[PDB]
Amino acid sequence: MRIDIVTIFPACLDPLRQSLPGKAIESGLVDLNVHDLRRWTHDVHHSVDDAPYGGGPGMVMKAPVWGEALDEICSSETLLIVPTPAGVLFTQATAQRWTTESHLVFACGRYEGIDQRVVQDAARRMRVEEVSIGDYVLPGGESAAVVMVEAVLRLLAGLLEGPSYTRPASWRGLDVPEVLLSGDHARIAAWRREVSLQRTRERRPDLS
Amino acid sequence: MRIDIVTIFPACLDPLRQSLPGKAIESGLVDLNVHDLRRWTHDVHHSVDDAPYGGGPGMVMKAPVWGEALDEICSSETLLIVPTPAGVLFTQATAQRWTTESHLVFACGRYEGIDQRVVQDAARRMRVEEVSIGDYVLPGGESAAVVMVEAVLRLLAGLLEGPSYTRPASWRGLDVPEVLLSGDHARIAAWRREVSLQRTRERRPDLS
Ligand SMILES: CCCCCCCCNCc1ccc(CNC(=O)c2csc3nc[nH]c(=O)c23)cc1
Numbered sequence: 229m230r231i232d233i234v235t236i237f238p239a240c241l242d243p244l245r246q247s248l249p250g251k252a253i254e255s256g257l258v259d260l261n262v263h264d265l266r267r268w269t270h271d272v273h274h275s276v277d278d279a280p281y282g283g284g285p286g287m288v289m290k291a292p293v294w295g296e297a298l299d300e301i302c303s304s305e306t307l308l309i310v311p312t313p314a315g316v317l318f319t320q321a322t323a324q325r326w327t328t329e330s331h332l333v334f335a336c337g338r339y340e341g342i343d344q345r346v347v348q349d350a351a352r353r354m355r356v357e358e359v360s361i362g363d364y365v366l367p368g369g370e371s372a373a374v375v376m377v378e379a380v381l382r383l384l385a386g387l388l389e390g391p392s393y394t395r396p397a398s399w400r401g402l403d404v405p406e407v408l409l410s411g412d413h414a415r416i417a418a419w420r421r422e423v424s425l426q427r428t429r430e431r432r433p434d435l436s
Numbered sequence: 437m438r439i440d441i442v443t444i445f446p447a448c449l450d451p452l453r454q455s456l457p458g459k460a461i462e463s464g465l466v467d468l469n470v471h472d473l474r475r476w477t478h479d480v481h482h483s484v485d486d487a488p489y490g491g492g493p494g495m496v497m498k499a500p501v502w503g504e505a506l507d508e509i510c511s512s513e514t515l516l517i518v519p520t521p522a523g524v525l526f527t528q529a530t531a532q533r534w535t536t537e538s539h540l541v542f543a544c545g546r547y548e549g550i551d552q553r554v555v556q557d558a559a560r561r562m563r564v565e566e567v568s569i570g571d572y573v574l575p576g577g578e579s580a581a582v583v584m585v586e587a588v589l590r591l592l593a594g595l596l597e598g599p600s601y602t603r604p605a606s607w608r609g610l611d612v613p614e615v616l617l618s619g620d621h622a623r624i625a626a627w628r629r630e631v632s633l634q635r636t637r638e639r640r641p642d643l644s
């Protein structure tokens with residue numbers, strides 16, 4: 229898998245060179261490239277942002293600079309991912325589906341986002357996905373791209389989860405559930421499913 | 437605000453020293469400390485993980501090492517945050533509420549998570565929150581803590597969003613909507629609300 233990430237903050241993708249992602253990249257499974265969006269600008273001040281049409285707060289990322297960067301990095305086979313608070317929610321099924329892709333391109337935005345015509349122009353030649361990592365507001369899309377790449381890379385390398393325990397059996401007056409010390413595989417699996425259904429009902433009832 | 441993050445991978449929190457978070461930290465608003473969990477171990481091999489009771493895949497983070505680290509860093513006023521796939525979903529309202537906290541402690545887990553008795557023992561003296569950033573699986577909680585800190589720090593420093601546009605008015609045969617060039621504040625706001633309702637219905641109908 230070839231992964232390209234375009235951003236005004238390349239240093240923010242540095243966690244992808246460590247731990248699980250780092251291993252996958254070093255072992256030739258993944259070819260990861262981080263690019264500074266300013267390398268495609270032609271002006272003296274390397275500007276990437278301009279004032280929005282119709283007024284509004286902040287700045288908007290210019291379509292011609294994104295258009296040059298994507299023209300160079302993308303092909304007809306590329307899946308262009310645009311992290312955005314207005315996208316569809318990223319899920320485990322999306323992470324699983326993206327392991328089947330040959331080339332993923334993450335266009336990380338800052339300011340108030342990227343001019344909408346970049347994605348419309350990209351959609352004429354390649355598949356585009358506008359994706360949110362959740363119902364909260366981030367300063368940019370770099371940390372969302374890290375999250376998305378980590379979910380995809382761990383699937384390449386290889387109800388809510390219930391509680392887990394390890395030694396000691398008693399710690400600060402707190403005992404490991406007696407069932408986990410039974411040796412009985414069947415009642416262990418039954419208890420884990422039971423506490424997993426219970427935690428799901430309390431914390432995420434939408435999942436049952 | 438004082439923020440402490442405990443992890444076996446301190447380098448994975450390096451994006452918090454750049455951009456928006458970096459500014460907030462440097463300007464004395466936020467006091468950020470990253471700690472290596474191995475600094476509280478006493479064994480020769482600095483082990484943080486052990487085999488799970490009741491069998492299962494992988495390893496579980498030991499309660500005594502987490503117990504020592506939290507005993508030193510936390511007080512009765514501390515809000516202990518445990519990033520976990522089994523937690524409640526992180527939202528904008530949570531990010532807003534956490535700006536009111538004096539001391540936030542993020543206990544980042546690796547392997548299959550942290551022994552459950554750590555949070556039960558912590559809940560005897562401090563407020564604890566078990567939080568997920570979304571319905572996808574990550575290799576650990578460092579990138580989820582980055583996401584959570586970035587959402588909180590941007591609120592300190594200061595329906596789905598509709599499309600945005602900037603110069604030029606025509607780019608690759610794609611024109612900026614005529615309404616955004618009208619000068620008419622009222623029909624601009626009406627059009628933006630309209631395209632925002634439309635995008636919400638298509639991509640996130642659960643929000644209306
Ligand atoms: C005083 C300055 C003006 C501030 C006005 C802020 C109003 C909100 N503008 C919308 C906006 C918010 C955040 C972003 C950056 N977010 C991401 O790139 C992002 C990418 S994926 C994602 N997932 C969840 N939430 C997210 O914010 C994101 C882009 C546009």
Ligand SMILES: CCCCCCCCNCc1ccc(CNC(=O)c2csc3nc[nH]c(=O)c23)cc1
Pocket residue numbers: 389493494519520521545546547548549567568569570571572573574575576577578580
């Ligand atoms: C062959 C090795 C065995 C693999 C078995 C994996 C089965 C799943 N175990 C549960 C588990 C998954 C991920 C984690 C690490 N995740 C986070 O720390 C995390 C912290 S916040 C969060 N939000 C969404 N998703 C997340 O995964 C997280 C911890 C326990």
